Amino acid sequence: MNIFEALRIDEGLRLKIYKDTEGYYTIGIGHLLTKSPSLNAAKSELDKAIGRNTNGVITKDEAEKLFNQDVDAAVRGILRNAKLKPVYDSLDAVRRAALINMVFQMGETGVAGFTNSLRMLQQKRWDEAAVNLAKSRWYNQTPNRAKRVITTFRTGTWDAYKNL
Ligand SMILES: [Cl-]
Numbered sequence: 001m002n003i004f005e006a007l008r009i010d011e012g013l014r015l016k017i018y019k020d021t022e023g024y025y026t027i028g029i030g031h032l033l034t035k036s037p038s039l040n041a042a043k044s045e046l047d048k049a050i051g052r053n054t055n056g057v058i059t060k061d062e063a064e065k066l067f068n069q070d071v072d073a074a075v076r077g078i079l080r081n082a083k084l085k086p087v088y089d090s091l092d093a094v095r096r097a098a099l100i101n102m103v104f105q106m107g108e109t110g111v112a113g114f115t116n117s118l119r120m121l122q123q124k125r126w127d128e129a130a131v132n133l134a135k136s137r138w139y140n141q142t143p144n145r146a147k148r149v150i151t152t153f154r155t156g157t158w159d160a161y162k163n164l
């Protein structure tokens with residue numbers, strides 16, 4: 001198991017524009033197009049992202065390419081963030097992947113907001129961090145996914161993804 005495989009399980013893959021859990025226009029493997037309520041604006045962002053007139057549909061290869069870009073950007077966002085970098089450096093490879101998943105889902109800014117959890121993770125206080133992470137809108141809105149990421153932080157293994 002790895003970050004790519006994990007996120008592919010968590011986000012799924014859809015080749016036509018769809019609405020995510022928050023009602024935002026998205027495509028591929030969790031690639032957010034826009035927070036605007038307009039499908040046209042979404043179609044526009046889509047064409048600009050792929051480089052062609054898509055008409056709201058992309059191929060598997062296109063989805064994968066967006067996905068690669070997106071993972072790369074999450075990593076870079078982490079490394080550039082003063083609050084995130086140190087946590088990330090302190091963690092093992094498996095837990096680093098959980099942090100990347102969170103950033104991919106919610107953005108660098110969102111994650112950097114989990115101040116107390118981050119401190120706990122940095123201190124390697126696993127059970128405590130898990131409890132704290134759960135007291136969030138994030139866990140209440142997408143509990144099954146949140147539980148998978150949280151277990152990953154807690155145990156440092158990919159067990160929550162083994163079966164799926
Ligand atoms: Cl893009």
Ligand SMILES: [Cl-]
Nearest residue numbers: 142143144145
């Ligand atoms: Cl969920």
